[PDB]
Amino acid sequence: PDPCYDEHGLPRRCIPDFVNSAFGKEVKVSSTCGKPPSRYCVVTEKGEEQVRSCHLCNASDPKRAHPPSFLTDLNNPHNLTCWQSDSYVQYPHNVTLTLSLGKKFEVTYVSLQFCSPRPESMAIYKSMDYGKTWVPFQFYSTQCRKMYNKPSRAAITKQNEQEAICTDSHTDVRPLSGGLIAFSTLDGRPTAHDFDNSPVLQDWVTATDIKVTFSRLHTFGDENEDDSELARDSYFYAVSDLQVGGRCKCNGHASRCVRDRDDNLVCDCKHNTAGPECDRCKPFHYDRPWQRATAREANECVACNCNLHARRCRFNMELYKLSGRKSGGVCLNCRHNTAGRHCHYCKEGFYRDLSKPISHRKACKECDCHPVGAAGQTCNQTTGQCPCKDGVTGITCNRCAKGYQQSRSPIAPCIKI
Amino acid sequence: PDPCYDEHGLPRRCIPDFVNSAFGKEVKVSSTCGKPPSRYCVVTEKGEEQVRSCHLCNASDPKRAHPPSFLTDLNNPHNLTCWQSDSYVQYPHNVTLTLSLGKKFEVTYVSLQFCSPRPESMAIYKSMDYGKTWVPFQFYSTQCRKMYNKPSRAAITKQNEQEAICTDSHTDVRPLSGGLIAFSTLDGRPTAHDFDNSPVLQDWVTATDIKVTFSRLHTFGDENEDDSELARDSYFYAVSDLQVGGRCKCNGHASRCVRDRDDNLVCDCKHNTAGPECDRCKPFHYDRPWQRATAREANECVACNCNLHARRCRFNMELYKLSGRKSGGVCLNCRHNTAGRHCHYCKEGFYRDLSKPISHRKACKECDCHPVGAAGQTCNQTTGQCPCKDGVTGITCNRCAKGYQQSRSPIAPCIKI
Amino acid sequence: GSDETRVPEVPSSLHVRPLVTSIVVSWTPPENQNIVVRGYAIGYGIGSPHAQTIKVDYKQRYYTIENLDPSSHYVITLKAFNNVGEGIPLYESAVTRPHTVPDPTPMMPPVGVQASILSHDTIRITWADNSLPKHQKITDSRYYTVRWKTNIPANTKYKNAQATTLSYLVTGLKPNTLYEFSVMVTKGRRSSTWSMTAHGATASG
Amino acid sequence: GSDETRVPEVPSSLHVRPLVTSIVVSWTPPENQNIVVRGYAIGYGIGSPHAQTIKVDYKQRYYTIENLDPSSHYVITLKAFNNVGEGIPLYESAVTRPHTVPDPTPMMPPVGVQASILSHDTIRITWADNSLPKHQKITDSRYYTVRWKTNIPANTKYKNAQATTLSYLVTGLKPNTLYEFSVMVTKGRRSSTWSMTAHGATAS
Ligand SMILES: *[C@@H]1O[C@H](CO)[C@@H](O)[C@H](O)[C@H]1NC(C)=O
Ligand SMILES: *[C@@H]1O[C@H](CO)[C@@H](O)[C@H](O)[C@H]1NC(C)=O
Ligand SMILES: *[C@@H]1O[C@H](CO)[C@@H](O)[C@H](O)[C@H]1NC(C)=O
Ligand SMILES: *[C@@H]1O[C@H](CO)[C@@H](O)[C@H](O)[C@H]1NC(C)=O
Ligand SMILES: *[C@@H]1O[C@H](CO)[C@@H](O)[C@H](O)[C@H]1NC(C)=O
Ligand SMILES: *[C@@H]1O[C@H](CO)[C@@H](O)[C@H](O)[C@H]1NC(C)=O
Ligand SMILES: [Ca+2]
Ligand SMILES: [Ca+2]
């Protein structure tokens, strides 16, 4: 049951389940009501009539409390749990929800379901590293130029696919409650259909962190003053549910993510790949450059070919180019006295034992060159013939040639009878 | 820290830790005292004076109780825990302890530490399949011929190395307590030093189950005139500790044993091997026959070479012998239109596309032989030249040869002016 | 057993099969059967499943979402529910795609293509069709596509025109140049490959 | 903390280095330090560690078992103990083995080996040593080993003899058979490879 491989036995692009990555997670918030106990008011409509009712937020009474576990908790339409900000946070104040995924995600959407009216202006930023730096994702506002300094709804082009846009969509009250904002990461982007083959778009959807910031409140309702406060305590942010939908980013080389030894989240790497995102080749499979799966080719890494004289190799782009873009692997630290690109021949001073297959611990046999009779210790790889001295013969140069006999000199071991 | 592989990076013989395989385990016994509360007497020596004191086994007084747990529990010389048999179970009767390891073990020794006088006759049987069949391991008796119908201590030869022997050793009625019987499996066996390369001895030492049977009691003490029962209740079997020392058997290919998903125990095979005992090659890795690690060669299994057009293979002994005992692997159901032993050439009806390397999906390109102009769809692999008809030429047979022109017949498409 | 004290758990499996304008969603009930499930709620949408929610009873193991935009990416969420509320969802996403119609068996290409050279300007080529009665007149709707290119060099972009008859006149051409001709037949949804190539050269005038 | 209510746990690591007639046992204390350890008990034996037990204090990370037999398989058990008793053992087994001495730097083989054929029965061969003064007489204790074999067929297992002088008489041979001779020098623990081969064939 491995989806990363065929009916048999070849590999194929596999992707982790579509999930809500914000579910178990804890969200850090800039504002929350109940400390100290505070008043908040909700305005409702019947025909054209406003009815303003006021309640108390008691950060410590688990019934009138609104902690930010109520962003990521179970969403039940019946008993609804909402995080809620301080009563009056207004422009130029803003409230920030910030959520860390823990792994690189390819994010299909970000969605907030509000228990208050939606914001007039709201910004969404992401982080493709782990919270060290932030870049904008989406902007929502009535007046985009004057607020976020970005143009209003704009044509995204094949030049800039990565431009965060700003739309007046979902900036509308109403609903006064249960309002929904859904940001699709691939919405309005030209190359979306080709996403599989579009790297810029694969990048755009990648985030380790999501941070939403509510910039401005809709002013809604009639100030009736014995105290202005009643209308003031009624403008705040509340959201019942936060969802960042998407898939764990494995680059198509893994069907699931699992908890590491450190309880880190990582891909369960297949297709001979390594790395947390399966972004690199497994240690011995360097024979060709790493590549993400295209749903046509799985682009698995393939092991170096060493003759079982080495388990280390490195890739060479030139040797790859010359191979007809087949095999660029070269081998390191060839043992068993072998040497070569693939450890396919013998080191100086050795020769091939053809009694033994090319992959054998003893495949390379040392040529014993006679100390007195030979002119050097380096012999011929194929034959094993040593560089015999003058008048000397033999494979090892251990005997005198025909018409010769041994002298008492080491320099000239053989002379003629 | 993988012991199965070199300083880098090649493999080597690796062996699981030496352990007492009987420790956590529960051993089944035929006899235990407490069922009714029963009497037992111990005889002690001071000088030439004997002193017999009696106690009560009562298997529900965790104090006065002697459960078989006490065989495999922690051995502490201070607080001693002993299983104890029924009072006077004597020849022709015998008491049997039987212990199941759960894994194939290479057992270096089996040792019993008694709280009673040792047996005059005792037998050790093993099981190499799981509780299904039993074969003798060792025999201990004063008279071996009359008891076990085996000769007394006997010379083993390089023939009968698997023969269980019988010695009169460790049959001595003293010590009256703390007596010890240690059966070494490799003791006295000729090829023991060469155990690494001796398969019969590797077999001999292999057991999944151990069963000891105490055949006959030493009768020791002075018969008492009041009640004979006192001399009867003083004769029993008692054991402080049961040990089967040895290493989990992984045939030299694993450095540890671990429990799989079904919670049974198995080897953590490495070396491209598979099986409980790493007795077989991992799928797609049988290019050469399996072999246990010799501490010289690790004898790892080698993957079949298919051009990434299939992962299935089977071994061919003949093709191995012809290879010079190198590679006997052949590939099954070559996909991507290739075919061959290694999937190194093209199926009938295709030809080699040399813009693409042999491992490319498109390495084999179909030769489209013209329906009208060609005499068949099977072309030459090298050229891609289709089997042209009588008056036609071309690579695909898509035109008439010179001095010819098209006819209106599909059967003889080209004729002469 | 049956327990309504709490919301049902998450479903055991969810699976989605995308079609042209529709999507078939199939699933299996939550593992613990002690928790009562009254029904299943299926949310769906483009880019996110907040667009529309459809409820079915506890007996349904599949549903076909209809009236969906073509070549679109749908996110689908599947929950089980009882009188307490809705449970933890499963997500799956699928993309609607045009159905791929299996290719029809190919027709046999025209035969007997011949080039008759009138002038430097034009060459007339004719052929035959064995899919036609020997009188060679057309009834069912056929059309022949005729392509020609310059033989020198080994490549030139083909020019092609059509014919409702078994003859055609190639008009704009280069004087004194060898030309490669060929023709295919197409009838209804079935077509044929290109015929054997016939060569001819203009009058050099 | 320090706790004597119970027996100490099992030691953290055990390792054995076998040597020719002794065995070096090294270890590390049990993980939890709350359980007080008075010492360590080392059982050892052939085939099973019931032969002898040796106790050492809590300060020892190693001990050398001595007076062991010399090509033998020893099983070793390591426990830690306090006044309660002994804890759960670790096991390890090792084999005493002969030390591996090699190798002394090789000498230069004899030169000028010559074969003189005396009879059908015997052949007398002579040689020279360049590690000797030109008078070629022996002082330090050297000996030359001389090997011979039949050249036909390609192999025959060699016959060899030793000599304290620079000549030797090979007797007991087949008449009219070609023989291959060679000589090596050995001095003390140092040795040389075999010299260049000299051939000669016995008389009618
Ligand atoms: C909030 O809860 C704590 C305990 O519920 C209580 O002391 C406090 O009165 C509550 N809020 C108000 C009204 O102060
Ligand atoms: C239901 O909602 C109330 C208030 O909204 C909250 O106190 C309680 O924890 C919630 N419980 C569940 C199961 O949602
Ligand atoms: C948040 O408010 C601060 C000051 O109140 C302002 O400097 C900043 O630009 C605001 N950020 C957003 C995203 O509105
Ligand atoms: C045996 O021991 C148990 C536990 O004390 C006790 O219940 C039972 O009555 C005893 N009977 C004896 C000692 O005969
Ligand atoms: C002490 O010994 C008694 C009887 O021998 C036994 O029941 C008990 O379990 C022992 N205690 C420990 C801690 O082993
Ligand atoms: C055990 O006893 C039974 C009868 O009591 C006898 O048949 C059998 O041979 C005995 N086995 C051994 C191993 O002594
Ligand atoms: Ca909620
Ligand atoms: Ca015990």
**How many angstroms separate the CA atoms of A51 and A44, rounded?**
5
Substitution target from A15, A17, A18, A23 for chain C, most C beta carbons within 10 A: A18
* Chain D residues lying within 8 Å of B180, measured CB to CB: 50
Q: What residue in D sits closest to B112 (Cα-Cα)?
A: D50
**How many angstroms separate the CA atoms of C180 and B396, rounded?**
15
Asked, colleague to colleague, whether C1-101 and C102-205 share their fold, the answer is yes
Interface touch D111/A408, C-beta < 8 Å: yes
* Nearest residue by C-alpha to atom 12 in ligand 3: A215
* Nearest residue by C-alpha to atom 5 in ligand 4: B61
Residues of A at the B interface, defined by Cβ within 8 angstroms: 8-10, 284, 297, 302, 308-312, 323-327, 333, 335, 354, 356-359, 361
Would you call C69 exposed, middle or buried from its count of C-beta atoms within 10 A (0-12, 13-18, 19+)?
A: exposed
Torsion of CA C68, C73, C79, C84, to 10 degrees: -80
Give the three-state DSSP class for B196. helix
User: Residue for token digits 């005292």?
Assistant: B33
Interface touch A184/C89, C-beta < 8 Å: no
**How many angstroms separate the CA atoms of B379 and B397, rounded?**
11
- Ordered by start, the domain boundaries in chain D are 1-101, 102-204
Burial B277-303 (b: 16+ CB within 10 A, else e): bbbbbbebbbbbebbbbeeebbbbbbb
Q: Who among C50, C71, C86 is closest to A77 (CB)?
A: C86
Task: Report how far ligand 1's centroid is from the alpha carbon of C107 (Å).
Answer: 86
Looking at the complex, report in whole angstroms how far the Cα of residue B70 sits from the nearest Cα belonging to chain D. Answer: 14
**How many angstroms separate the CA atoms of B290 and B283, rounded?**
12
Say if A329 is an interface residue toward chain C (CB within 8 Å): no
Q: What residue in A sits closest to C87 (Cα-Cα)?
A: A76
Range list of β-strands (E), B25-94: 27-29, 38-46, 49-57, 83-84
Our measurement of the distance from residue C183's CA atom to the centroid of its chain's CA atoms, rounded to an integer in Å, reads: 25
CB C30 within 8 A of CB C8: yes
Pair type for strands B257-259 and B238-248? unpaired
The encoded tokens of residue B9 equal: 């990076």
**How many angstroms separate the CA atoms of A390 and B239, rounded?**
81
Looking at the complex, report in whole angstroms how far the Cα of residue D133 sits from the nearest Cα belonging to chain A. Answer: 13
Instruction: List Cα–Cα distances, D114 to A106, A403, A417, D119, D149, in angstroms.
Output: 86, 14, 12, 16, 15
H or E segment and range at residue B322? helix B317-322
The encoded tokens of residue C123 equal: 């060459």
Chains contacting D with at least 3 CB pairs below 8 Å? A, B
Ligand 5 pocket member B167 (CB < 6 A) = no
* Chain A residues lying within 8 Å of B288, measured CB to CB: none
Q: What are phi and psi of B399, to 5 degrees?
A: -145, 165
User: Residue for token digits 């070629």?
Assistant: D136
Looking at residue B5, the DSSP 8-state letter turns out to be: B
User: Residue for token digits 């001999």?
Assistant: B204
Looking at residue B110, the DSSP 8-state letter turns out to be: E
Q: Where does ligand 6 bind, in terms of residues with CB under 6 Å? A: B 92-94, 123, 213, 215
Nearest CA to A374 out of A399, A409, A338 is that of A399
CB A206 within 8 A of CB A185: no
Strand partners, B352: B364
Say if A188 is an interface residue toward chain D (CB within 8 Å): no
Would you call A24 exposed, middle or buried from its count of C-beta atoms within 10 A (0-12, 13-18, 19+)?
A: exposed
**How many angstroms separate the CA atoms of D62 and D67, rounded?**
17
Instruction: List Cα–Cα distances, D147 to A345, A367, B125, C179, D158, in angstroms.
Output: 35, 22, 55, 88, 6
Cβ neighbors of C161 (< 8 A, separation 6 or more) are: C145, C146, C168, C170
Cβ neighbors of C74 (< 8 A, separation 6 or more) are: C18, C23, C44, C45, C46, C49, C65, C68, C93, C94, C95, C96
Strand partners, A184: A109
Looking at the complex, report in whole angstroms how far the Cα of residue B11 sits from the nearest Cα belonging to chain A. Answer: 9
Side-by-side strand order, sheet with C23-30: C11-18, C23-30, C62-65
CB D4 within 8 A of CB D84: yes
Pair type for strands A166-167 and A135-141? parallel
Nearest CA to C171 out of C145, C148, C152, C142 is that of C148
Which residue precedes each gap in chain B (C to N above 2.5 Å)? Answer: none
Interface touch D47/B180, C-beta < 8 Å: no
Nearest CA to B331 out of A306, A284, A10 is that of A10
Looking at residue A366, the DSSP 8-state letter turns out to be: E
D125-134: long-range contacts at Cβ-Cβ below 8 A with a sequence spacing of 24 or more?
A: D125/D167, D125/D168, D125/D170, D125/D181, D125/D183, D125/D198, D125/D200, D126/D166, D126/D167, D126/D168, D127/D166, D127/D167, D127/D183, D127/D195, D128/A408, D128/D166, D129/D166, D129/D185, D130/A408, D130/A410, D131/D107, D131/D185, D131/D187
The encoded tokens of residue B40 equal: 């037992």
Torsion of CA A145, A150, A153, A157, to 10 degrees: 150
End-to-end, the C-alpha distance of chain A in Å comes to 81
Would you call D55 exposed, middle or buried from its count of C-beta atoms within 10 A (0-12, 13-18, 19+)?
A: middle
Q: What residue in B sits closest to A331 (Cα-Cα)?
A: B9
Looking at residue B119, the DSSP 8-state letter turns out to be: P
Evaluate the CA torsion angle B28, B34, B38, B44 in order and state its sign.
positive
CA-angle at B78, arms to B76 and B79, nearest 5°: 75
The encoded tokens of residue C81 equal: 């529910």
What DSSP letter does each residue of C26-87 carry, written as one string?
EEEEES-SSB---EEEEEEEESSTTSEEEEEETT-SEEEE-S--SS-EEEEEEEEEETTEE-
CA-angle at A398, arms to A393 and A401, nearest 5°: 30
SS (H, E, C) C109-122: CCEEEEEEECCCCC
Would you call B383 exposed, middle or buried from its count of C-beta atoms within 10 A (0-12, 13-18, 19+)?
A: exposed
Would you call A122 exposed, middle or buried from its count of C-beta atoms within 10 A (0-12, 13-18, 19+)?
A: buried
Q: Is B252 left (phi over 0), alpha (psi -120 to 50) or beta?
A: left
Ligand 4 pocket member B60 (CB < 6 A) = yes
Would you call A283 exposed, middle or buried from its count of C-beta atoms within 10 A (0-12, 13-18, 19+)?
A: middle
HSE on the CB side for B217, CA within 13 Å?
23
Task: Report how far ligand 4's centroid is from the alpha carbon of B61 (Å).
Answer: 6
Q: What are phi and psi of B202, to 5 degrees?
A: -65, -30
Q: Is A122 left (phi over 0), alpha (psi -120 to 50) or beta?
A: beta
**How many angstroms separate the CA atoms of D29 and D12, rounded?**
6
Q: Which ligand is nearest to the CA of B147?
A: 6
**How many angstroms separate the CA atoms of B329 and B343, rounded?**
12
Q: Do chains A and C touch (3 or more CB pairs under 8 A)?
A: yes
The encoded tokens of residue D84 equal: 């309660």
Task: Report how far ligand 3's centroid is from the alpha carbon of A39 (Å).
Answer: 25
User: Residue for token digits 């300060």?
Assistant: D59
Q: Who among B368, B372, B409 is closest to C196 (CB)?
A: B372
**How many angstroms separate the CA atoms of B15 and C11, rounded?**
45
Say if C85 is an interface residue toward chain A (CB within 8 Å): yes
Q: Which ligand is nearest to the CA of B65?
A: 5
Q: What are phi and psi of A53, to 5 degrees?
A: -115, 140
**How many angstroms separate the CA atoms of A78 and A72, rounded?**
16
Number of C-beta neighbours around residue B212 at 10 A: 25
Task: Report how far ligand 4's centroid is from the alpha carbon of B83 (Å).
Answer: 18
Instruction: List Cα–Cα distances, A7 to A2, A4, A350, B223, in angstroms.
Output: 9, 10, 47, 80
CB D51 within 8 A of CB B184: no
Range list of β-strands (E), B175-308: 180-184, 206-216, 238-248, 257-259, 265-267, 273-274, 280-281
Ligand 4 pocket member B380 (CB < 6 A) = no
Q: Do chains C and D touch (3 or more CB pairs under 8 A)?
A: no
Looking at the complex, report in whole angstroms how far the Cα of residue B395 sits from the nearest Cα belonging to chain C. Answer: 12
Task: Report how far ligand 3's centroid is from the alpha carbon of A149 (Å).
Answer: 12
Pair type for strands D167-170 and D159-163? unpaired
Class of domain D102-204: mainly beta
The domain made up of D1-101 is a member of CATH 1.10.630.10? no
CA-angle at D38, arms to D34 and D40, nearest 5°: 110
**Range list of H helices, A158-298:** 199-204, 229-232
Q: Who among B398, B407, B409 is closest to C197 (CB)?
A: B398
The encoded tokens of residue C14 equal: 């969810």
**How many angstroms separate the CA atoms of C143 and C110, rounded?**
11
Nearest CA to C190 out of C106, C100, C102 is that of C106
Q: Look at chain C and count its residues.
A: 205
Cβ neighbors of A3 (< 8 A, separation 6 or more) are: A12, A14, A255
**How many angstroms separate the CA atoms of B377 and B389, rounded?**
12
The domains found in chain B, sorted by start residue, are: 1-269 (2.60.120.260), 270-417 (no CATH)
H or E segment and range at residue D81? strand D73-82
CATH of C102-205, one of 2.60.40.10, 1.20.120.80, 3.40.50.300, 3.40.190.150: 2.60.40.10
Range list of β-strands (E), A142-188: 166-167, 180-184
Our measurement of the distance from residue C100's CA atom to the centroid of its chain's CA atoms, rounded to an integer in Å, reads: 4
Q: Look at chain A and count its residues.
A: 417
Instruction: List Cα–Cα distances, B200 to B163, B165, B287, B337, D141, in angstroms.
Output: 11, 16, 26, 48, 48
**How many angstroms separate the CA atoms of B399 and B373, rounded?**
7
Task: Report how far ligand 3's centroid is from the alpha carbon of A94 (Å).
Answer: 6
The encoded tokens of residue B36 equal: 């009714």
Our measurement of the distance from residue D35's CA atom to the centroid of its chain's CA atoms, rounded to an integer in Å, reads: 45
Burial B44-65 (b: 16+ CB within 10 A, else e): eeeeeeeeeeeeebbbeeeeeb
* Chain B residues lying within 8 Å of A358, measured CB to CB: 326
End-to-end, the C-alpha distance of chain C in Å comes to 97
Would you call A83 exposed, middle or buried from its count of C-beta atoms within 10 A (0-12, 13-18, 19+)?
A: buried
Give the three-state DSSP class for A196. helix
Identify whether B289 is preceded by a cis peptide bond (ω within 30 of 0).
Answer: no
CB A206 within 8 A of CB A101: no
Strand partners, A110: A183, A244
CB B281 within 8 A of CB B301: yes
Q: Is A408 left (phi over 0), alpha (psi -120 to 50) or beta?
A: alpha
Chains contacting B with at least 3 CB pairs below 8 Å? A, C, D
* Nearest residue by C-alpha to atom 10 in ligand 5: B79
Q: What are phi and psi of B295, to 5 degrees?
A: 70, -10
Looking at the complex, report in whole angstroms how far the Cα of residue B238 sits from the nearest Cα belonging to chain D. Answer: 19
Q: Resolution in Å, one decimal, please.
A: 3.2
Say if A175 is an interface residue toward chain D (CB within 8 Å): no
**How many angstroms separate the CA atoms of A298 and A292, rounded?**
7
Evaluate the CA torsion angle B161, B164, B166, B172 in order and state its sign.
positive
User: Residue for token digits 């201990």?
Assistant: B140
Side-by-side strand order, sheet with D62-65: D13-18, D23-28, D62-65
Instruction: List Cα–Cα distances, D69 to D18, D121, D162, in angstroms.
Output: 11, 49, 34
The encoded tokens of residue A407 equal: 């002298």
Identify whether B16 is preceded by a cis peptide bond (ω within 30 of 0).
Answer: no
Number of C-beta neighbours around residue A371 at 10 A: 20
**Range list of H helices, B1-112:** 69-72
- Choose one of B74, B81, B115, B241 to mutate for the ligand 5 pocket test, by most ligand atoms within 8 angstroms of C-beta: B81
CB B392 within 8 A of CB B413: yes
**How many angstroms separate the CA atoms of C48 and C78, rounded?**
13
